[PDB]
Design a binder for this molecule. Structure first.
Ligand SMILES: [Mg+2]
Ligand SMILES: [Zn+2]
Ligand SMILES: [Zn+2]
Lengths: 217, 1241, 73
């Protein structure tokens, strides 16, 4: 009744979203320099085979079966390659996702917001340079995550170029709270940002995250 | 629009949700940060939801009322009124459809019970932890299974060959190694053998995997779970025409599409037929949820959501709070999460992302929508600021503070005020007093109307200014506007029907509501800072009903009994008691001198006596001989003196007091004479008699004159309290010190330790209680009758002998915080003043009392809520159901040949079932007799010791009850009305005295809840002769039967519980009805042993006895209305064989109709009131009481239609209450002016 | 437990809130060249006190209906 309900409490609270996907990303083993290059070559060969087959599809000349099945097999090889690469590169995405925990947006979505940037990275990766796909994709993961966190983190919309000021305001206010000890003043904030002290007042009123109705007071 | 009938519930199918919606939500944005207008196709957006402000487009093109129905081509919003923002719902198109949580996390899971899964397995399927195979083609997989088994066998042969080859190679390698090296070698042999063993393990695991793949491929069917998904990965590409499978809710949509319901039904029928036991038990819960979809029109397709509806913008509003801050609703966050996740998933489908990412996005989306519909339903809830969970949609329909319990039941109103109440003793019972400013504010339109209808205000605006300035010209008008215009006075908490009363507002100066002194008994309102609300009925109907129903003058008698509540109390009692009390040895007393002098004290008129009393010559209380004319004489005196004619003008001599004459002068011209002191019981009896005999207006005036005279004489009463007026009795100390002498010996034996603590405590408590009673007797004896304390007490005005006992002599014994009595009593009177010890001991009981009474109000409120919610349906629907069935009331105490004391609560104010036949058949009373005191007396004088009365317990009505079977009403004083809501009257009346209920409230609570007793005393299943087996520690009771067979045995019988007092002894005979032990019989036991009617008697007897104990009296029929609402359903063991689950509570009439079979098997059940309001026929009320989601889910899938026959539901929806003045025979009445009146004009 | 102790608890909780920030601060800052006057967080104590008299049930508005009301309060 206590131990059984303890076991039931152990069994019921099972997935928890994060542990459900950590399992999934845990399965497909990560690549090394050769396999990344091979799968990139395979991807771009597949895309080249599709952009080739477009010609023979739209224009004409119904080619013999063997070469067609070969080209289809190269398309499928490209698909397999991009899918296997995307299934490989994920622990990077979660490792970068684990930086932006409790920053308006939920930790769970930021991984997928990372995965979009990852897929764009996979789209626009250049193997000829031979960069390491982590060190390459770091750009796209970050830019995608922070581009999402710019918009969807807040209830009210504020563009990235007008929220970066609020984030950096937060950071440097934390810095000035850390160093000087006390709270700094909008004037000194405007002296730090090099702006009109009537703007930092305007940006704080935006920085007021809205309050609920059904709250026990 | 204005009209309504039966409401029905269902499941919102994606097409129906799309058919609701006006546009699609496809942006996570709320509002623009600069301009604060909502963005296009986001939350709050003006395109789909209509415009924000009244007559405005988004950009700003049309703001005229001229243009109605036109849709601007610039933005695309429709120019209409802003109200539609509360009436317009949105929708969200999901790329992948997700399931609804309600039919999943509910116990049992319904989705799983439709497609026969375990809820954990279903969970795993819907939350993307498993693939499910939707449809397998047995014929197509069977046909070419041979070839696939051949290529399988080849696929095995290959890996067998490779295994053999590698084993051979490693063996050859080993032998070559040994041959090359030839202890150190034997180790390398061991290593080689180990590696061969590893090859063997790899090979056997591969073969096992292949064999298991073929096994799981061969054994394939719909509704099957895959654990690892390597099986499905290998099964995915090969066999691409035989089976299909998806993860999530789309799979469940395809599954519910690939489903014929009648097959599952007819399979279920043979499963419940053949598979009787656990499988029939599991089939039993499936029966209802499956069989619903056949009898109902709605499909099970609507359990999975392709589109999700969006609650209107204003129910989840974003308005800026004072100081620049923004106040939003949590819904916005959840909807934003859902739409964001959706809009990401769409892009994941657009790009062509991998299936794991997409399915994880779908899982997270599922979790988000699940959370949005119900947060904290699955696992950890979503938290925004400071780790507090956000209120989901189902959170806005559940809990104590969501809806129903607070939001739909009670709310603040217009044309309404609240002030401090004060006694206004000048006023007539129908009149009240209003603070003239408060009044001026309360009738602010009604005054303006008259001020512009007259030439006092030139224009309506100017009138609205003049009423604001409160100018001298409005006050002469406010009388003209308030002239016979009723107002509804209400005090929270409203404990009974007379807790609200309508009055005529008189305009008074000051800041106080001048209440009438007679309605304080009803309102339960002491003038010690209590406040009452006033309401202004606006509609002609409301104004009329205020004047007709709830006018104080009409509501004199209690709904509870029919005793007058609007009667002299506290002051008026002492006033009239002094006025009428005849005391000897007074001034101007009638002596009747013997031969020497005249009689001296005779009076020609009451006027002469008033003239004599105005002089300091005659006292108002003396035996005097008036000659009376205007007052109707006593029955005997009329019978003697006049006989033929009455006495309006006829004169007669009395022997009374001027006060009694002055009192009788108040009572009606034709009413006979009293000549008796007005004790509150006698006042109650007279006013009750007057209420029974005369019209209500007459009584309502006579009681007003009684009030006027009462208070006028309450002054000249001479009732004051003083240190000299309160007297300590002389025997107090003599008794106290005589009990101290023995108490000393008790405490001495206790100190010695010869007597136990409990024995000494008991002895001392007994002694000092005896002493307390003695001091009480001394207080009773010593005090003169003219003493003010005796007047305030022994007139019945207030208090009791106990209070004057505590004030004169000794406070007595006083209890610990536990309840056990402290052996040391309070020997000092409150006149004498207490010692620190005595007072400090007194504090306990006072505080405990204050606490328990401070809880009692809330507990009794809670009880009254249940007792109202249970009897929501019991309204008088028709005149007569035409039955001969009735309950049998004794009406007489075994002769005499000895009248019954509780006739007044039992068989008084009741319609009869039969003709009152006697021994011969000299039939005295016929059917349809009110049973008034004359009739009740006549039935006693006839010589019958029983009568069969027609009650609600035996009423054959389709809906509620029929008028004639209820009996006459207590409120009206006539036959109960064909509209009356006798159920909620009964509920209020039974619910009210719980505050005054000081063995107690637990017993009535547990009785009405029908729960197992605190002391389970057994009743006799069979009659027979009792035998005593005096066992060790406990008892054992055996009844030897009359018919012949086995004797009834119970194991452990509690000795401390005590056997029933004819007394229980070894070798007596006891009846079937008789309870064996002294305490409480288990209602279920009594039902199953005897039957419904004896329990119907027992419950009413038991509920009455505890009221009779506390002194309050309610009329049995009010209990019988609730006991009826208890005993009116059946429990089914196993029967029906068509949409009837075994172990299901079923309503009588609906059960009987299908049971009889013109073209089942039920036993009587006794249900608890909560278990009755839980198992009610209605759904939106059942939802309003408790467990909203549970019942509403069932209601939705069942498609269960409520008739709105119950009042409680018809309160929640703002519709005309069907009870009282809301039946079709009332609400539709064509009143034409009569043909003779028309032409006359 | 009286005003002194009821404050002392919030000083304790504030100082415990400070101890973590100190434990981090001395971990991140250089060895010897740190200066505890230089590196010390004032927030978590002043917050712990300000929050005791800000909204907490045991820090009530004085009953100034009269002296006696205050004295009893
Ligand atoms: Mg009071
Ligand atoms: Zn427009
Ligand atoms: Zn009836």
């Amino acid at each position: 009744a206590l131990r059984q309900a303890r076991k039931d409490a152990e069994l019921t609270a099972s997935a928890d979203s994060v542990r459900a996907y950590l399992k999934q990303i845990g399965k497909v083993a990560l690549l090394n320099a050769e396999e990344e290059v091979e799968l990139a070559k395979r991807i771009e060969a597949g895309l080249y085979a599709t952009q080739k087959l477009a010609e023979l599809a739209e224009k004409g000349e119904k080619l013999p079966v063997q070469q067609r099945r070969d080209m289809q097999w190269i398309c499928r090889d490209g698909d397999r390659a991009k899918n296997h690469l995307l299934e490989a590169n994920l622990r990077l995405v979660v490792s970068l996702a684990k930086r932006y925990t409790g920053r308006g947006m939920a930790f769970l979505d930021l991984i997928q917001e990372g995965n979009l940037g990852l897929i764009r990275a996979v789209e626009k990766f250049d193997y000829t340079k031979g960069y390491k796909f982590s060190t390459y994709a770091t750009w796209w993961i970050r830019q995608a995550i922070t581009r999402a966190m710019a918009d969807q983190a807040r209830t009210i919309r504020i563009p990235v170029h007008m929220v970066e000021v609020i984030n950096k305001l937060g950071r440097i206010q934390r810095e000035l709270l850390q160093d000087l000890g006390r709270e700094p003043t909008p004037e000194e904030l405007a002296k730090e940002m090099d702006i009109t002290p009537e703007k930092v007042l305007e940006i704080q009123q935006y920085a007021r995250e809205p309050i609920s109705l059904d709250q026990t007071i | 629009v204005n009209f309504f009938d039966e409401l029905r519930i269902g499941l919102a199918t994606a097409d129906d949700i799309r058919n609701w919606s006006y546009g699609e939500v496809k942006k996570p944005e709320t509002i623009n940060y600069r301009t604060l207008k909502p963005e296009k196709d986001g939350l709050f957006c003006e395109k789909i939801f209509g415009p924000t402000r009244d007559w405005e487009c988004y950009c700003g093109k049309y703001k005229r009322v001229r243009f109605k129905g036109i849709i601007c081509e610039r933005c695309g919003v429709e120019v209409t009124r802003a109200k539609v923002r509360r009436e317009r719902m949105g929708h969200i198109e999901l790329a992948a459809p997700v399931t609804h949580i309600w039919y999943f996390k509910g116990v049992p899971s319904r989705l799983g019970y439709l497609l026969d899964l375990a809820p954990k397995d279903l969970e795993k399927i819907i939350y993307f932890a498993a693939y499910v195979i939707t449809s397998v083609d047995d014929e197509m997989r069977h046909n070419e299974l041979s070839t696939l088994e051949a290529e399988m066998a080849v696929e095995k042969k290959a890996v067998e060959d490779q295994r053999d080859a590698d084993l051979e190679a490693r063996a050859q390698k080993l032998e070559a190694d040994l041959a090359e090296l030839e202890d150190v070698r034997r180790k390398v042999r061991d290593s080689g053998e180990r590696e061969m063993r590893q090859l063997r393990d790899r090979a056997q695991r591969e073969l096992d995997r292949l064999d298991e793949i073929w096994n799981t491929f061969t054994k394939l069917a719909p509704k099957q779970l895959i654990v690892d998904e390597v099986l499905y990965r290998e099964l995915q590409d090969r066999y691409g025409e035989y089976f299909t499978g998806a993860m999530g809710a789309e799979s469940i949509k395809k599954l519910i599409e690939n489903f014929d319901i009648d097959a599952e039904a007819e399979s279920l029928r043979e499963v419940i037929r053949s598979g009787k036991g656990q499988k029939k038990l599991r089939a039993l819960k499936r029966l209802k949820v499956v069989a619903a979809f056949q009898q109902s029109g709605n499909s099970p397709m609507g359990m999975v959501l392709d589109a999700v509806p969006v609650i209107p913008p204003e129910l989840r509003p974003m308005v800026q709070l004072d100081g620049g801050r923004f106040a939003t609703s949590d819904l916005n966050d959840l909807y934003r999460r859902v739409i964001n996740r959706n809009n990401r998933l769409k892009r994941l489908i657009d790009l062509g992302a991998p299936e794991i990412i997409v399915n994880n996005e779908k899982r997270m989306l599922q979790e988000s929508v699940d959370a949005l519909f119900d947060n904290g339903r699955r696992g950890r809830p979503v938290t925004g600021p400071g780790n507090r969970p956000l209120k989901s949609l189902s959170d806005l329909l559940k809990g104590k503070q969501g809806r129903f319990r607070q939001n739909l039941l009670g709310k603040r109103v217009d044309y309404s005020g609240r002030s401090v109440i004060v006694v206004g003793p000048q006023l007539k019972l129908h009149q009240c007093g209003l603070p003239k400013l408060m009044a001026l504010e309360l009738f602010k339109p009604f005054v303006m109307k008259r001020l512009v209808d007259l030439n006092h205000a030139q224009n309506i605006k100017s009138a609205k200014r003049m009423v604001e300035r409160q100018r001298p010209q409005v006050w002469d008008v406010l009388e003209e506007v308030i002239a016979e215009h009723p107002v509804l006075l209400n005090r929270a908490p409203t404990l009974h029907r007379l807790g609200i009363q309508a009055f005529e507002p008189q305009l008074v100066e000051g800041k106080a509501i001048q209440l009438h002194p007679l309605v304080c008994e009803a309102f339960n309102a002491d003038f010690d800072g209590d406040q009452m609300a006033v309401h202004l009925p606006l509609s002609a109907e409301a104004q009329a009903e205020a004047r007709i129903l709830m006018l104080s003058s009409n509501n004199i008698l209690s709904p509870a009994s029919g005793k007058p509540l609007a009667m002299p109390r506290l002051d008026m009692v002492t006033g009239l008691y002094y006025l009428t009390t005849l005391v000897e040895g007074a001034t101007g007393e009638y002596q009747a001198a013997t031969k020497d002098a005249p009689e001296q004290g005779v009076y020609s008129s009451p006027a002469e006596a008033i003239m004599a009393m105005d002089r300091g010559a005659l006292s108002v209380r003396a035996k005097i001989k008036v000659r009376l004319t205007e007052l109707r004489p006593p029955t005997d005196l009329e019978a003697q003196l006049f006989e033929n004619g009455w006495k309006p003008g006829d004169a007669w001599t009395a022997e009374t007091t001027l006060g009694r004459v002055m009192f009788n002068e108040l009572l009606p011209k034709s009413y006979p004479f009293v000549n008796e002191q007005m004790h509150k019981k006698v006042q109650a009896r007279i006013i009750n008699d007057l209420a029974e005999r005369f019209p209500m207006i007459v009584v309502a005036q006579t009681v007003d004159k009684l009030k006027d005279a009462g208070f006028y004489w309450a002054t000249r009463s001479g009732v004051t309290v003083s240190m000299a007026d309160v007297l300590v009795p002389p025997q107090k100390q003599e008794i106290l010190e005589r009990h101290e002498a023995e108490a000393d010996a008790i405490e001495r034996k206790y100190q010695r330790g010869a007597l136990n603590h409990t024995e000494r405590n008991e002895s001392l408590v007994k002694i000092w209680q005896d002493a307390t009673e003695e001091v009480g007797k001394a207080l009773e004896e010593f005090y003169p009758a003219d003493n003010p304390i005796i007047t305030i007490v022994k007139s019945g005005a207030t208090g009791n002998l106990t209070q004057t006992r505590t004030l004169a002599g000794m406070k007595g014994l006083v209890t610990n915080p536990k309840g056990e009595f402290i052996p040391r009593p309070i020997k000092s009177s409150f006149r004498e003043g207490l010692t620190v010890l005595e007072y400090f001991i007194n504090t306990h009981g006072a505080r405990k009392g204050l606490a328990d009474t401070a809880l009692r109000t809330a507990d009794s409120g809670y009880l009254t809520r249940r007792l109202v919610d249970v009897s929501q349906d019991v309204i008088v629907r028709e005149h007569d159901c035409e039955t001969e069935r009735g309950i049998n009331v004794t009406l007489a105490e075994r002769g005499p040949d000895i009248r019954d004391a509780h006739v007044e609560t039992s068989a008084f104010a009741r319609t009869l079932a039969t003709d009152a036949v006697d021994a011969n058949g000299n039939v005295i009373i016929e059917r349809g007799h009110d049973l008034g005191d004359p009739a009740i007396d006549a039935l006693l004088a006839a010589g019958i010791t029983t009568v069969k009365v027609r009650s609600v317990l035996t009423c054959t009505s389709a809906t509620g009850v029929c008028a004639m079977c209820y009996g006459r009403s207590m409120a009206t004083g006539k036959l109960v009305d064909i509209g009356e809501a006798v159920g909620i009257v009964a509920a209020q009346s039974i619910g009210e005295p719980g505050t005054q209920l000081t063995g107690g409230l637990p017993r009535v609570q547990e009785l009405f809840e029908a729960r197992v007793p605190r002391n389970k005393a057994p009743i006799a299943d069979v009659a027979g002769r009792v035998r005593l087996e005096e066992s060790d520690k406990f008892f054992k009771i055996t009844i030897v039967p009359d018919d012949g067979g086995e004797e009834v045995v119970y194991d452990k019988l509690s000795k401390r519980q005590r056997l029933r007092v004819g007394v229980l002894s070894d070798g007596d005979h006891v009846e079937v009805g008789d309870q064996l032990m002294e305490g409480a019989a288990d209602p279920h036991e009594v039902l199953r042993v005897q039957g419904p009617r004896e329990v119907q008697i027992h419950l009413v007897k038991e509920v009455q006895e505890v009221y009779r104990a506390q002194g309050v009296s309610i009329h049995d029929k009010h209990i019988e209305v609730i006991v009826r609402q208890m005993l009116r359903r059946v429990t089914i063991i196993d029967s029906g064989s068509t949409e009837f689950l075994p172990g299901s509570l079923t309503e009588r009439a609906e059960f009987e109709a299908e049971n009889r079979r013109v073209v089942a098997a039920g036993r009587p059940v006794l249900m608890g009131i909560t278990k009755a309001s839980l198992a009610t026929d209605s759904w939106l009320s059942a939802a309003s009481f408790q467990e909203t989601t549970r019942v509403l889910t069932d209601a939705a899938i069942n498609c269960r239609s409520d008739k709105l026959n119950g009042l409680k539901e018809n309160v929640i929806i703002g519709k005309l209450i069907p009870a009282g003045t809301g039946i079709s025979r009332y609400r539709n009445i064509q009143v034409q002016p009569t043909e003779e009146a028309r032409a006359a004009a | 437990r009286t005003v002194g102790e009821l404050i002392q608890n919030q000083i304790r909780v504030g100082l415990s809130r400070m101890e973590r920030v100190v434990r981090e601060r001395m971990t991140t800052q250089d060895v010897e060249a740190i200066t505890p006057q230089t590196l010390i967080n004032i927030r978590p104590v002043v917050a712990a006190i300000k929050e005791f008299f800000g909204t907490s049930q045991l820090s009530q508005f004085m009953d100034q209906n009269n002296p006696l009301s205050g004295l009893t309060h």
